[PDB]
Amino acid sequence: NLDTLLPLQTIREHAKCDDNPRVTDDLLKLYREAAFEAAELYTGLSFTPEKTIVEPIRLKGRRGKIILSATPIAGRPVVFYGGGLGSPLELIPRPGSNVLFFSQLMATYVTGRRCENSVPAGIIIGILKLIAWNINNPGDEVMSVRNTLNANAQGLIGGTNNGAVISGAQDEWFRYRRVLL
Amino acid sequence: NTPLQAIGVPVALYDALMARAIDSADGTPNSKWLVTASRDLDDGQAKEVKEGI
Numbered sequence: 001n002l003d004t005l006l007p008l009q010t011i012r013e014h015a016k017c018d019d020n021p022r023v024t025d026d027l028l029k030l031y032r033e034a035a036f037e038a039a040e041l042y043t044g045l046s047f048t049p050e051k052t053i054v055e056p057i058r059l060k061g062r063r064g065k066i067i068l069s070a071t072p073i074a075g076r077p078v079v080f081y082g083g084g085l086g087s088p089l090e091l092i093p094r095p096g097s098n099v100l101f102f103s104q105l106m107a108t109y110v111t112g113r114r115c116e117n118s119v120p121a122g123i124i125i126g127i128l129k130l131i132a133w134n135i136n137n138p139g140d141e142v143m144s145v146r147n148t149l150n151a152n153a154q155g156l157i158g159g160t161n162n163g164a165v166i167s168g169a170q171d172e173w174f175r176y177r178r179v180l181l
Numbered sequence: 182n183t184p185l186q187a188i189g190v191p192v193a194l195y196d197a198l199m200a201r202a203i204d205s206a207d208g209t210p211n212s213k214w215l216v217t218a219s220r221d222l223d224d225g226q227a228k229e230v231k232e233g234i
Contacts, residue, residue: 179226181233 002036005047005118006127015132023135035130039123039164043173047119050112057083057105066100068093072109082106096178122175129169 008028012018040047053070057080060067072078077090083105091100093109113119137143142158144150150157164170216234218227 175223179222179230181230 002033006032006036006124008032011128011131014128015135017135028131028135031131031134032127035127035134039126039130039169039173042170043123043177045119045123045176046112048112049116049118050110050114052108052110054106054108057107059102059105064102066102066107068098068100068107068109070109070111071096071098072111076110078107078109080105080107120176122172126169126172129167129172130164133164133167133169 008025011028011032017023036047050073053072055069057066057068059065068078072093074095075092077092078100079088079090081088083103085105093100139162141149142156143161144157160166214234216231218230222230
């Protein structure tokens with residue numbers, strides 16, 4: 001529950017704020033908890049251990065195709081039932097991919113990483129970068145490269161310079177995002 | 182006095198052109214869609230993009 005897999009001490013040591021009384025524990029908790037789902041929703045990976053799923057299935061294409069929604073597991077049969085089946089049928093997925101082949105057709109499996117030793121360092125590095133940006137960079141002024149403040153005699157280039165993306169946070173997590181096809 | 186006196190040039194030209202054609206028939210890659218990615222794509226999914234296309 002985010003207390004054991006991201007100790008506030010590690011955050012306070014990363015962003016070097018261990019002596020700031022203006023970042024109380026409740027505020028850091030709000031940051032740590034709004035960034036453990038603003039960049040989990042983004043990657044579509046639950047963080048709890050292996051967590052079963054049950055969901056309907058709709059075949060697509062004349063040759064049969066079953067698009068799941070979890071990239072289920074490595075080496076454990078996903079089983080199908082209902083929907084005109086006379087006996088639950090078991091398929092074996094191929095690692096990483098979430099496509100299979102052969103009164104609604106249902107399917108069940110188990111997604112997630114085996115152990116409780118949860119999300120790899122890649123995920124955490126993203127959060128650490130996202131938190132740090134959040135605590136010492138509120139959105140009140142547009143910046144520029146090297147936190148400089150320019151003028152431009154025209155529109156600020158600050159198209160962004162005010163969004164997670166800026167920190168290599170958002171792009172770290174991407175390394176685990178899978179470019180659909 | 183035979184026709185073969187005055188057909189050396191065109192028959193040689195014909196041979197050269199047909200040899201060029203035969204050669205280029207096998208040797209020019211018959212592939213389309215020269216696709217290219219960038220050095221930031223984690224080959225391990227660039228395999229997956231290829232399998233997608």
